[PDB]
Design a protein around this ligand. Structure first.
Ligand SMILES: Cn1cc(CNCC2CCN(c3ncc(C(=O)NO)cn3)CC2)c2ccccc21
Ligand SMILES: [K+]
Ligand SMILES: [K+]
Ligand SMILES: [Zn+2]
Length: 364
């Protein structure tokens, strides 16, 4: 019953080097350990993914290119245009090893779930949901969520992927767009000019996977109570129509008030309610992180959610620890949203929910 916590010092040290989130993995782990939450979990060292494990989704040519430019960080290689490596996804030195470690961490969590070691396994440094089988994308060099789902498919016949990141989980949706055995549900900002431009409510999958992809397009300024209302309404229909046997849950914290992107107006309490609704299904659940560019707020969010997973209530006072000064000026766990307009007109929200309920009729 005790949740598995994927962690090692080597793993955190590698994840700390990712370009857009310097030291975020150490902050997340350090805050969790300062609340002593790791003492209530089964700590599991992640294995590094092998080439053949990564190739269950990614092409050998992509992985070999990534490995080659990773050796010295060749960010000027003429073939990188083939593979999505460039301004947004630079060929950092060591990026292949970091990708292999994150992929391996998510696979390890999936393996713990299928071995019955736990009902909940956590890889807070995972959630690289934009990566494609032969292209890096949106800071994602390897799609560890896809690798996790594929591992879970060795044992579980139907997997539900739920993506609460601010951005559409397009890489995961694409990987499974043509199958009814994996259903993807993404709540995300959908607006002209907002990356990656996909995931309208009319995108429902393709072929035999038609109606087994679900997209909930949301506008700026949504807050906890309406977001949870939307999420519960969709997930309730999904659970009834699809009958999942296992769940992969991406919890990117770029929805949280105070993020540099400043789109949604969420607090960890609202995401926590979504998490609780999924946990009460009592299915094997693989928990991933993702985006989150206010480093201290992301650590606030995921520490709180770790608390939710353990059924614990955490003290408001941020405990003294290595990154204590990042939590100023108030040094508390809670995040106060700002007072700004919610651009989600309730009639449009009901149109979207009705559309989705109609789509899920076609599902058995
Ligand atoms: C496909 N496509 C490509 C572009 C080019 N610019 C996009 C950059 C990509 C890189 N980037 C980016 N990546 C990941 C995240 C994240 O948190 N993902 O969960 C956030 N930000 C900034 C925006 C683009 C812009 C708008 C709409 C679609 C478009
Ligand atoms: K999302
Ligand atoms: K699908
Ligand atoms: Zn994001």
């Amino acid at each position: 019953l005790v949740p598995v916590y994927i962690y090692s010092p080597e793993y955190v040290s590698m994840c700390d080097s990712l370009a857009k989130i310097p030291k975020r993995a150490s902050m997340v782990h350090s805050l969790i350990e300062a609340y002593a939450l790791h003492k209530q979990m089964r700590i599991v060292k992640p294995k590094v993914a092998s080439m053949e494990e990564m190739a269950t989704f990614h092409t050998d040519a992509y992985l070999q290119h990534l490995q080659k430019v990773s050796q010295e960080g060749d960010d000027d290689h003429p073939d990188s245009i083939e593979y999505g490596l460039g301004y947004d996804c630079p060929a950092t030195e060591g990026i292949f090893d970091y990708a292999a470690a994150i992929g391996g961490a998510t696979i390890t969590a999936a393996q713990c779930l299928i071995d019955g070691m736990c009902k909940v396994a956590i890889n807070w440094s995972g959630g690289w949901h934009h990566a494609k089988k032969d292209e890096a994308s949106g800071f994602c060099y390897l799609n560890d969520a896809v690798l996790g789902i594929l591992r879970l498919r060795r044992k579980f016949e139907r997997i539900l992927y739920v993506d609460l990141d601010l951005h559409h989980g397009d890489g995961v949706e694409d990987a499974f767009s043509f199958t009814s055995k994996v259903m993807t549900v993404s709540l995300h900002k959908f607006s002209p000019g907002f990356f990656p431009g996909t995931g309208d409510v009319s995108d429902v999958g393709l072929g035999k996977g038609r109606y087994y992809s679900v997209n909930v397009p949301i506008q700026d300024g949504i807050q906890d109570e309406k977001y949870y209302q939307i999420c519960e309404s969709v997930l309730k229909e999904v659970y009834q129509a699809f009958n999942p046997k296992a769940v992969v849950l991406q919890l990117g914290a770029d929805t949280i008030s105070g993020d540099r992107l400043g789109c949604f107006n969420m607090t960890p309490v609202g995401i926590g309610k979504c998490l609780k609704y999924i946990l009460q299904w009592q299915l094997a659940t693989l928990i991933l992180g993702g985006g989150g560019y206010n480093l201290a707020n992301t650590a606030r969010c995921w520490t709180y959610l770790t608390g939710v997973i353990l059924g614990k209530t955490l003290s408001s006072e941020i405990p003294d620890h290595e990154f204590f000064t990042a939590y100023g000026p108030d040094y508390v766990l809670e995040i106060t949203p700002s007072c700004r307009p919610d651009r989600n007109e309730p009639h449009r929200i009901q149109q979207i929910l009705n559309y989705i309920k109609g789509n899920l009729k076609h599902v058995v």
